[PDB]
Amino acid sequence: ARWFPKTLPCDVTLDVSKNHVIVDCTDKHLTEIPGGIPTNTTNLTLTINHIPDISPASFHRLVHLVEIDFRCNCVPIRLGSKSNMCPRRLQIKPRSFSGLTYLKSLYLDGNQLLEIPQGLPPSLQLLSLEANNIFSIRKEQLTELANIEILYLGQNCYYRNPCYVSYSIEKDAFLNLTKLKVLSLKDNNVTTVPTVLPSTLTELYLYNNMIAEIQEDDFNNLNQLQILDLSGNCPRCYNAPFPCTPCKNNSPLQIPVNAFDALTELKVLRLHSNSLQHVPPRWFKNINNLQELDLSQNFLAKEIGDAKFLHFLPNLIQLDLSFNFELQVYRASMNLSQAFSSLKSLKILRIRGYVFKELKSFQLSPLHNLQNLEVLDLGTNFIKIANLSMFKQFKRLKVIDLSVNKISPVLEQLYYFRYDKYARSCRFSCYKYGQTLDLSKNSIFFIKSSDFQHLSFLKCLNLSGNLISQTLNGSEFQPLAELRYLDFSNNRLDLLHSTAFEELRKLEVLDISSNSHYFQSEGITHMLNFTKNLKVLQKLMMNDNDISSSTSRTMESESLRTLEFRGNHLDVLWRDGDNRYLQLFKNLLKLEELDISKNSLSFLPSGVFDGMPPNLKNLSLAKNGLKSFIWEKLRYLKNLETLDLSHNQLTTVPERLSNCSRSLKNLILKNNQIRSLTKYFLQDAFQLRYLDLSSNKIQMIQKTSFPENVLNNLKMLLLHHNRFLCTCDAVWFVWWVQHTEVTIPYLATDVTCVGPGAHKGQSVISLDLYTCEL
Amino acid sequence: ARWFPKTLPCDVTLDVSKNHVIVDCTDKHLTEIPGGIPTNTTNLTLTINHIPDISPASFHRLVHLVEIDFRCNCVPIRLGSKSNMCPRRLQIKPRSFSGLTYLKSLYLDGNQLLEIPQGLPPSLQLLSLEANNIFSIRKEQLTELANIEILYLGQNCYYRNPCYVSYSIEKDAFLNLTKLKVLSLKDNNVTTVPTVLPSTLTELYLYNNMIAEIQEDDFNNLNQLQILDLSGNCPRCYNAPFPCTPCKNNSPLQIPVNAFDALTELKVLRLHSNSLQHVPPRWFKNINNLQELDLSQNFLAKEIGDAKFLHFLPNLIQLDLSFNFELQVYRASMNLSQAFSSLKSLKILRIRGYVFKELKSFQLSPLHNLQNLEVLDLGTNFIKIANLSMFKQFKRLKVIDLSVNKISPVLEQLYYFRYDKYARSCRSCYKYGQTLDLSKNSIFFIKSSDFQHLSFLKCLNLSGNLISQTLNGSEFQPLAELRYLDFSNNRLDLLHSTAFEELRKLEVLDISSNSHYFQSEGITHMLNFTKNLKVLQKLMMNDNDISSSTSRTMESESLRTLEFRGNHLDVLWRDGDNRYLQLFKNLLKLEELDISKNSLSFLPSGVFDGMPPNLKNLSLAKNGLKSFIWEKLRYLKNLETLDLSHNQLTTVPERLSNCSRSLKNLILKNNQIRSLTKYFLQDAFQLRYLDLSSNKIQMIQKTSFPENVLNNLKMLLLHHNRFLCTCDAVWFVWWVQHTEVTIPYLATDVTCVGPGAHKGQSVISLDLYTCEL
Ligand SMILES: *[C@@H]1O[C@H](CO)[C@@H](O[C@@H]2O[C@H](CO)[C@@H](O)[C@H](O)[C@H]2NC(C)=O)[C@H](O)[C@H]1NC(C)=O
Ligand SMILES: *[C@@H]1O[C@H](CO)[C@@H](O[C@@H]2O[C@H](CO)[C@@H](O)[C@H](O)[C@H]2NC(C)=O)[C@H](O)[C@H]1NC(C)=O
Ligand SMILES: *[C@@H]1O[C@H](CO)[C@@H](O)[C@H](O)[C@H]1NC(C)=O
Ligand SMILES: *[C@@H]1O[C@H](CO)[C@@H](O)[C@H](O)[C@H]1NC(C)=O
Ligand SMILES: *[C@@H]1O[C@H](CO)[C@@H](O)[C@H](O)[C@H]1NC(C)=O
Ligand SMILES: *[C@@H]1O[C@H](CO)[C@@H](O)[C@H](O)[C@H]1NC(C)=O
Ligand SMILES: *[C@@H]1O[C@H](CO)[C@@H](O)[C@H](O)[C@H]1NC(C)=O
Ligand SMILES: *[C@@H]1O[C@H](CO)[C@@H](O)[C@H](O)[C@H]1NC(C)=O
Ligand SMILES: *[C@@H]1O[C@H](CO)[C@@H](O)[C@H](O)[C@H]1NC(C)=O
Numbered sequence A: 001a002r003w004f005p006k007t008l009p010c011d012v013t014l015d016v017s018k019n020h021v022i023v024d025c026t027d028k029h030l031t032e033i034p035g036g037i038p039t040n041t042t043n044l045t046l047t048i049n050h051i052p053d054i055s056p057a058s059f060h061r062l063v064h065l066v067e068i069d070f071r072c073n074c075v076p077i078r079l080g081s082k083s084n085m086c087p088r089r090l091q092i093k094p095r096s097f098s099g100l101t102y103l104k105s106l107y108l109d110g111n112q113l114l115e116i117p118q119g120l121p122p123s124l125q126l127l128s129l130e131a132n133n134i135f136s137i138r139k140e141q142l143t144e145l146a147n148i149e150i151l152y153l154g155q156n157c158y159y160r161n162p163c164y165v166s167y168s169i170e171k172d173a174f175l176n177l178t179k180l181k182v183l184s185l186k187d188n189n190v191t192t193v194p195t196v197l198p199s200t201l202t203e204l205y206l207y208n209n210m211i212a213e214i215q216e217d218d219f220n221n222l223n224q225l226q227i228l229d230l231s232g233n234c235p236r237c238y239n240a241p242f243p244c245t246p247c248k249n250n251s252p253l254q255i256p257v258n259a260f261d262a263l264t265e266l267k268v269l270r271l272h273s274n275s276l277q278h279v280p281p282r283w284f285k286n287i288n289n290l291q292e293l294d295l296s297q298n299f300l301a302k303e304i305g306d307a308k309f310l311h312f313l314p315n316l317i318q319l320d321l322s323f324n325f326e327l328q329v330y331r332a333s334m335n336l337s338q339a340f341s342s343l344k345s346l347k348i349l350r351i352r353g354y355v356f357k358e359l360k361s362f363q364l365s366p367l368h369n370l371q372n373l374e375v376l377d378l379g380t381n382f383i384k385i386a387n388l389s390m391f392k393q394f395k396r397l398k399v400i401d402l403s404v405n406k407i408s409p410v411l412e413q414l415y416y417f418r419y420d421k422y423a424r425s426c427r428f429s430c431y432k433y434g435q436t437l438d439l440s441k442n443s444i445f446f447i448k449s450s451d452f453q454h455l456s457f458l459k460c461l462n463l464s465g466n467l468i469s470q471t472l473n474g475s476e477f478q479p480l481a482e483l484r485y486l487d488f489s490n491n492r493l494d495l496l497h498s499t500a501f502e503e504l505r506k507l508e509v510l511d512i513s514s515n516s517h518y519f520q521s522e523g524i525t526h527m528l529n530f531t532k533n534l535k536v537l538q539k540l541m542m543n544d545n546d547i548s549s550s551t552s553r554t555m556e557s558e559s560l561r562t563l564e565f566r567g568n569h570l571d572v573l574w575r576d577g578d579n580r581y582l583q584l585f586k587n588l589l590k591l592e593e594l595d596i597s598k599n600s601l602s603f604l605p606s607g608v609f610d611g612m613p614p615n616l617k618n619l620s621l622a623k624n625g626l627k628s629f630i631w632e633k634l635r636y637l638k639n640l641e642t643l644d645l646s647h648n649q650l651t652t653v654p655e656r657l658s659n660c661s662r663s664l665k666n667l668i669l670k671n672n673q674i675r676s677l678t679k680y681f682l683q684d685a686f687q688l689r690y691l692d693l694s695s696n697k698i699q700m701i702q703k704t705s706f707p708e709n710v711l712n713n714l715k716m717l718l719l720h721h722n723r724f725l726c727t728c729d730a731v732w733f734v735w736w737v738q739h740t741e742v743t744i745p746y747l748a749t750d751v752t753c754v755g756p757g758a759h760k761g762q763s764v765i766s767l768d769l770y771t772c773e774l
Numbered sequence B: 001a002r003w004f005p006k007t008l009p010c011d012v013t014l015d016v017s018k019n020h021v022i023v024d025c026t027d028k029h030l031t032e033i034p035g036g037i038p039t040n041t042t043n044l045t046l047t048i049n050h051i052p053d054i055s056p057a058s059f060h061r062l063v064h065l066v067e068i069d070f071r072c073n074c075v076p077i078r079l080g081s082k083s084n085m086c087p088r089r090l091q092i093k094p095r096s097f098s099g100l101t102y103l104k105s106l107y108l109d110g111n112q113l114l115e116i117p118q119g120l121p122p123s124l125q126l127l128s129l130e131a132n133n134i135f136s137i138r139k140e141q142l143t144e145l146a147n148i149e150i151l152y153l154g155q156n157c158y159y160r161n162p163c164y165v166s167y168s169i170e171k172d173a174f175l176n177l178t179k180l181k182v183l184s185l186k187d188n189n190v191t192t193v194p195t196v197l198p199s200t201l202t203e204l205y206l207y208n209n210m211i212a213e214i215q216e217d218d219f220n221n222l223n224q225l226q227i228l229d230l231s232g233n234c235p236r237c238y239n240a241p242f243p244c245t246p247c248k249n250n251s252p253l254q255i256p257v258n259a260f261d262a263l264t265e266l267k268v269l270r271l272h273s274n275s276l277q278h279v280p281p282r283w284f285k286n287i288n289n290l291q292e293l294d295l296s297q298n299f300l301a302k303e304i305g306d307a308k309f310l311h312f313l314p315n316l317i318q319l320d321l322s323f324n325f326e327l328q329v330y331r332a333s334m335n336l337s338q339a340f341s342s343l344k345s346l347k348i349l350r351i352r353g354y355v356f357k358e359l360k361s362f363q364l365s366p367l368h369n370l371q372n373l374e375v376l377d378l379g380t381n382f383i384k385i386a387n388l389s390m391f392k393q394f395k396r397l398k399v400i401d402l403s404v405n406k407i408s409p410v411l412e413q414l415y416y417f418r419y420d421k422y423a424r425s426c427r428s429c430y431k432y433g434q435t436l437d438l439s440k441n442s443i444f445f446i447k448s449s450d451f452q453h454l455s456f457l458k459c460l461n462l463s464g465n466l467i468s469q470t471l472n473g474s475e476f477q478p479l480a481e482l483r484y485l486d487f488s489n490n491r492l493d494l495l496h497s498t499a500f501e502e503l504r505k506l507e508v509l510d511i512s513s514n515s516h517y518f519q520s521e522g523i524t525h526m527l528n529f530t531k532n533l534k535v536l537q538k539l540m541m542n543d544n545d546i547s548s549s550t551s552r553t554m555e556s557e558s559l560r561t562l563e564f565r566g567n568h569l570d571v572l573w574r575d576g577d578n579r580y581l582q583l584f585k586n587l588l589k590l591e592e593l594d595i596s597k598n599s600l601s602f603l604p605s606g607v608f609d610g611m612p613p614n615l616k617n618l619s620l621a622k623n624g625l626k627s628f629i630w631e632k633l634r635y636l637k638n639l640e641t642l643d644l645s646h647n648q649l650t651t652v653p654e655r656l657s658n659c660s661r662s663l664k665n666l667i668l669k670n671n672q673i674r675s676l677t678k679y680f681l682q683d684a685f686q687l688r689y690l691d692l693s694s695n696k697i698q699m700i701q702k703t704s705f706p707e708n709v710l711n712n713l714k715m716l717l718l719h720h721n722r723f724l725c726t727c728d729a730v731w732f733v734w735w736v737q738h739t740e741v742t743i744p745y746l747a748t749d750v751t752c753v754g755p756g757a758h759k760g761q762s763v764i765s766l767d768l769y770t771c772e773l
């Protein structure tokens, strides 16, 4: 189909609209820029390679470049691979970029550069130099950046990339950068706010530095500023997961009461981890447009009960007061100032880490008349006692979050404690259902109906990671008549009663994954036929339950479309010679997707496929140790579309796939032990659209197995990490791979000859077998 | 050193005392008996192979054989491998055994044989034919077995190996086998007790059959019988994990009151799963010596409160009454007859699956004066309430088992429910003293008074409860003698460094699989709690996902062993964060540290300097380790064992001896090593054990493996590499063939991968004479 094989080890994409030729060589194990990059390339990404220098030769012909991404070709030792350390910093020879008259964006992060590269073109709007060794900014080195709008200089001096001195910035270094909108000097060991800064700035990042004091002039001229982040200067270091040095004399970051007066356009102020003890109202006199305020990880426990500053914040949308607790103090109650009633526009309130014993309805009264309140997050508070019925006055909320508490009768997992949650790297949920109460990771042992009195509006309840060891019998959730989603994962469900959960008449999704406990002990009655009573259930997750026994022999539903049954013991239930459970799933009449991966199914007894429900479309048998498979039995699965046999020990494919299924579109066989294909494997398999044979032991593929009238209809064919022998017997396959339009990933990287000797480790895409045609 | 390489793919042991020559060819993927088997072989095992026939050639020279184990060369389809099914039953030609004049034992289990093999020599004492397809026994087929003592015929007709008819035994089939001692007809679809049986019988196994009725005279002559097992005839089928058919009209197995009158030597009576409703005392009239009685999986719930039969069993040692509950009944109390007090000799009482709500002290009062009682098993009873102080009257017991209950403020896992717990295959803190096992209960909160009067306990098992408490040293105050606490599979909240410090005699603490509170950010955890435990020897903290700690150091003057696998030292030792690099340094007496499975893809500098001084055994297995600075082992002056198995290492050090002068045992199995360094083991005089198996090694040269080190090795593992057998490999091939160093699997998985000719061939068989023309 193609007249010229694509030999370039980079993906190449078009956007004729925007006149773009996108060349992506990310992580291609390159040690030189590859020859034959298109002359018309506009976007060239060389991120995560080992190219040791840049020169006028590098981009010679490439005069139409608007963006070079040359990140992490020499990462700082502590940030980078320890098995392939960069021996010496990127060397940039003079005149490498001056040619590139259209260059708009240059990322040179993670290259251990010692200086801001000179001779940059005046077209440059974005320069990124994070994670280098540049720790002295001189005005002279910035004259080249006349038209720069975005400048990232952070991570040049911190614990993962130390420079062992204070950061230096010359007086007025940035002032003549008259179009500069975004300046980031984070994670840099900076000691003072650099002045004077250009009045064009909209975003200023100075977080995770060693700034002890703001001078009252520091932000005088910054009347277009919309985002200011001063977090992590005088950090709160308790339980820090990074080396954390507090300001001496236990000082806060010292901010004069009028420091923000010029900042009339400010929308986001981040004062996280500044050891603040008070928030002066005077801070907010001349900002009424502030929408986001982060005051997490300070010492503001007393202030929260006072908080007059809140009176000045009527347009505030998000407020974070998390982790403000006084060390070794466990308060009886939460004490919110009445001032919270003045946050008319508030949508998100987060107060984790206040640390208190009992939540009472009255303590939340100041929020009662906030009409736009959508999220109330009281996670990680060691709350022992909360009458959940108080949330009847919060029907308007989307999320009520009490996760990680001590109650008994998404932000990243590291959010409040991580050093820099916006760090760029260089290694290679039920809310949508409506109102959600998150009681995950609490100490709830026993539940009953009255616990949920007045909460019938709830659409999602998260009970994940509690201690519920109850024989649920369908009387425990009686008020929750509108619940569509129940997360009961990581409890100890005792499924004695086939009536469990039946009172949840609106339930569409039930997760009882990781409730293995009672399934582990012999002689205990379990009723897996409990699905019969759940009349509108669409999806059931029963993963990692260690299920090896069941009192009932069949599960029935007229609604269920998805069953996840991974991490059980169907191998035990279907022990060879025991026919009793071979119809376990047969009566799930509307089931379209069944995951029975990780069931130790080293073989499938006869009867399993005949026992499958009739509309089954997607079947996973992945990670079962399957050593054999009677392909002809797929004839029983008349609606089968996707079969996943990945990570098994299969050694063969069927003589004729066409004869095993009329319907099969997507066949996943990756990570098996297949050494060759059958002579007529895919002949007449016209319905096939996706075939994964990667990570097998295939040596040879011939046209009889892989007819072109089937291959050329595939959306993807995965062939990498096989054992291809590149002899004259391989001429057809090599020609066909070189010349096909069918998508085949990792050609540049992992579609390799293993022999014979001449060709060992050679990419098949580059292979020249002219000697076979002499 | 050896003159003649051993090419036989079987293990050969010599045992001069017993005149034995043992040849074990178990599981060697054989399709014929190997040539060259020693002429003097006495014990030949060919179990789990695919040898399709036996003939007079099979054992021609082997006239000294006393035992042939030829099990599972053609196993019934449902019992055998589905990836490598047997095509055709084993064929045994005439005269294959008749010349083996000294043959005492013949195992032919799992061969799909249709008939008892004939032409067996008169020396034979043991014949095993389990899991064949022999379901009719005729007296004429047994006349050859005149001297047989042990006969195994079970598993020839059951759900895993069906024959589709009742088993048949001709009348008096076994009568003339006048030395027969052990007869097993289990798992056979037998419908009646075969009679008349020889009076020499000592053990009779008739379990898992279809016997509905015992006749009064079925055991009339069996005056030497010691073990009788009638289990699984009229089974109790509730929650059975196999296809189970009960006798009609839930009838019990019907046993006349006088059925056991001749059995005056009987020691063991097994009546498990016989659907019994009553135990007639009359059964035991003439049986004075009974030591073991299994009455599990019946319907004896009412009988347990009456149990007049116990008055006839003063010599009984073990009694099992487990899983006798009445379906859909949850009793308030346990009701043990006063008759239990006559069980003078009793050591073990098991009453699981009685199913009752509340245990009270007085309910165990018939056991108070059983002076020999050692085990009381009340597991799997759904008990909700039990004042643990009641066990102050049971200080004499070794184990009190309350595992699997619902209490709140070593038998195999499928013991009571499995079909045949003695079937053969074709494929703990008790030692510390008095043990209370509270594992798999609903205990959510503990306090000192819970353990009032239990100060005698040496081991407490709290594994698999709900305990989510900030233990502070006040919860176990009565347990002054406790040596072992298993606290695994709870939700320990390690806020206080005083946790567990009241257990002043604690030697072993298991707090593994308490990951819950280590999974959420911002929670204070005090890993320095070890300082307060003054005689703690072993601490297990596996699978806790620990990625953070408020304290920077763990301290102990006593701890010898720390297991810390399945945590996140990778996060604690994040490169550039030095704060936790001495976490283990102050465990001054530590000799063993397991930090496997901690995602340590590299080791930061400072880890080895920070290890405690007497560290001897270190596991860094399963870490995805991609590089290792061998020279840093010089910090570990007492290191003897280093486990780097299942990682991604590609190189060995230039000279191991220069990295460590103490190292004895080096495990490098399952890495990516493709070559050894030129002088790898030079002068490594302390090395005793080296595992390089499951790497990618192509060649080994003599310089890497000097003979003055090799000859000190106790074991050298090289199997499953990528050995290239060219003339460059001459030294290695010769050396492997002639060394006395122990190399496992030396003919099985030490194989050439090339060149083409020798591909797949064992290096031990390789002739490389063309390299020397
Ligand atoms: C941030 O700057 C400070 C200096 O202000 C660096 O601290 C110095 O480090 C050197 C080398 O460790 C010491 O000899 C000096 O005494 C230190 N001075 C002070 C004032 O502490 C610090 O190393 C820098 N941080 C990073 C991560 O590079
Ligand atoms: C045990 O013996 C019984 C008969 O005594 C076998 O049951 C017969 O099985 C065949 C074929 O499956 C049926 O056609 C007959 O109807 C059965 N007879 C009765 C009375 O049930 C049974 O198959 C045997 N069991 C095994 C495991 O082989
Ligand atoms: C190409 O470069 C321009 C200018 O920096 C950028 O806006 C655009 O997103 C880039 N396109 C891609 C797909 O990388
Ligand atoms: C709440 O906080 C204010 C200011 O911190 C305090 O003075 C007041 O007494 C507190 N009210 C209650 C109910 O605790
Ligand atoms: C919880 O609050 C409701 C009122 O909303 C009340 O009916 C109930 O008694 C309270 N429950 C408890 C246990 O106090
Ligand atoms: C429930 O909360 C758990 C634990 O925080 C979380 O992992 C899970 O995704 C939540 N479930 C849903 C459905 O959002
Ligand atoms: C469930 O159990 C309760 C006791 O908790 C019992 O009263 C009731 O009969 C059962 N309810 C249903 C809905 O079956
Ligand atoms: C589930 O199976 C059991 C019989 O084992 C039966 O008693 C119960 O009624 C069944 N329940 C449903 C909902 O089918
Ligand atoms: C089955 O899998 C395909 C992709 O493999 C997916 O797009 C489809 O929606 C799935 N079908 C069902 C019913 O889950």
Ligand SMILES: *[C@@H]1O[C@H](CO)[C@@H](O)[C@H](O)[C@H]1NC(C)=O
Residues within 6 Å of the ligand: B020, B022, B042, B043, B066, B067, B104, B105
């Ligand atoms: C050898 O066979 C005899 C006779 O059956 C047996 O007693 C002995 O245990 C056997 N030894 C071994 C090691 O197989």
Ligand SMILES: *[C@@H]1O[C@H](CO)[C@@H](O)[C@H](O)[C@H]1NC(C)=O
Residues within 6 Å of the ligand: B302, B303, B305, B306, B335
């Ligand atoms: C115990 O059970 C026996 C026999 O059923 C009965 O006669 C006796 O009264 C029961 N005793 C108690 C305390 O239940």
Ligand SMILES: *[C@@H]1O[C@H](CO)[C@@H](O)[C@H](O)[C@H]1NC(C)=O
Residues within 6 Å of the ligand: B387, B388, B389, B390, B392, B452, B453
């Ligand atoms: C438990 O029994 C002991 C007597 O051994 C008694 O002191 C104690 O009060 C009882 N405990 C409870 C909670 O009843």
Ligand SMILES: *[C@@H]1O[C@H](CO)[C@@H](O)[C@H](O)[C@H]1NC(C)=O
Residues within 6 Å of the ligand: B403, B428, B429, B430, B437, B439, B440, B461, B463, B464, B484, B486
């Ligand atoms: C404690 O009981 C558990 C659950 O049965 C068991 O796995 C564990 O081995 C026991 N611990 C000890 C130390 O015996």
Ligand SMILES: *[C@@H]1O[C@H](CO)[C@@H](O)[C@H](O)[C@H]1NC(C)=O
Residues within 6 Å of the ligand: B472, B473, B474, B498
């Ligand atoms: C431990 O906490 C309990 C309250 O649960 C209390 O009795 C005791 O004072 C505390 N112990 C210590 C060491 O503070």
Ligand SMILES: *[C@@H]1O[C@H](CO)[C@@H](O)[C@H](O)[C@H]1NC(C)=O
Residues within 6 Å of the ligand: B497, B526, B528, B529, B531, B532, B550, B551, B552
């Ligand atoms: C453990 O470390 C903490 C501080 O992190 C300290 O306050 C406490 O006293 C230490 N405890 C012991 C037993 O060393």
Ligand SMILES: *[C@@H]1O[C@H](CO)[C@@H](O)[C@H](O)[C@H]1NC(C)=O
Residues within 6 Å of the ligand: B634, B657, B658, B659, B660
């Ligand atoms: C390693 O070898 C060198 C060169 O002989 C020697 O000088 C050095 O001391 C040795 N180190 C150890 C730890 O044996």
